[PDB]
Symmetry: C3
């Protein structure tokens, strides 16, 4: 079975798409968000290492800790506040930068599904699962802020309502 290897592979894949997304973001307009995304990459590197550990050991604790989840939650609340109230369902995209963040959103969910599957097979750091779960919410929230700061509409499913 290869669920563990696929899980840390998929967190690595996510990390690579985060790298691409950063490059879409102007340094001045998104200095906050760019800093967060670099932080997230560091954290995804730690999550991958944690996933690769078959059993956590005395001399080798998990690196991914609760604080990283708490931070995402703080930023999500901030970005929901910043963006216009959501009136309709959102289709991914708008600005190239927002689009790249929606890709990160969906790939986070893919990584999550694999960690859920791993958890069913054996021991994981539960922080990694919680982190990936919140990341999709984070990427959704910042994508909307990115469109907002760039003065472009989110793409909406027409005539829908939340």
């Amino acid at each position: 079975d290869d669920t563990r290897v696929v899980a840390y592979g998929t967190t690595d894949e996510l990390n690579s798409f985060v790298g691409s997304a950063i490059t879409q973001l102007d340094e001045n307009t998104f200095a906050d968000i760019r800093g967060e995304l670099f932080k997230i990459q560091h954290e995804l590197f730690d999550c991958g290492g944690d996933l690769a550990m078959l059993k956590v050991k005395e001399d080798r604790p998990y690196k991914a800790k609760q604080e990283i989840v708490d931070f995402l939650e703080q930023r999500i609340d901030a970005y929901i506040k910043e963006a216009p109230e959501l009136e309709r369902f959102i289709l991914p995209g708008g600005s190239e930068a927002a689009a790249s963040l929606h890709v990160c959103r969906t790939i986070a969910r893919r990584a999550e599904r694999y960690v859920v599957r791993l958890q069913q097979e054996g021991e994981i750091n539960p922080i990694v699962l919680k982190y990936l779960n919140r990341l999709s919410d984070y990427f959704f929230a910042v994508a909307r802020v990115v469109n907002s700061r760039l003065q472009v509409p989110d793409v909406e499913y027409e005539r829908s309502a939340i």
Copy 2:
């Protein structure tokens, strides 16, 4: 988790469509951009259909792709060679959509083996990979850049 994987992968495709749209000049590609926005609504509908244990995705959305595929095959150079993905950045982004549609399709096939699906969703994903291939070639054509040939 096949069902959840299938609708997550339709959502992933939808996100890649969102990125491809941003590669396309609004004037040069008004037709194809409008179609891609339409497809994103349809993929959202397909995801909802997949998550159901009436279906929203209907035959007409497949017939639309088929009509456009024909229109674009007519516009594009006569293909008699294997084509590798890429050329313009915009065409490349649409070839990515093609391959990710095929990934979504594989999961929906697997889901169909396990339980009832809306057959329209499978057929639509299948046709989408042909659509993305044909539009990618039109995009390179309109930009006056070559497709990438295998030989």
Copy 3:
């Protein structure tokens, strides 16, 4: 003619997604700075197409006229060495990204690893040309090496784990 889930059909499409991400990566690279790497990436696309054909032969009971041959693996190894030599000494772990071009090649790296995992799972269904697995294995190393050279030539730092 064949079932929708015929293993040979699935096997045939294994490397297509990676091929498309290579396509995107090429478009990020200026011919005047990257003629070498661009030429090799087109070569790799032709090779990935050949790998698909070979994978589709996994149930063939006769001798297989494989198209993927040792030489292409040797080629990647030599170019990797060249690019390691060019790039600055690697002393920290690298986070994927930096330039948009390098970021797109890090995406190829992770997608190649995904394709490699797919190919290992196909070994349960038939006999896989060993060159294809070796090739995909080395490709992730090739993409890592070129991503670093791409940042170097663009005079931008790699993104480091710190």
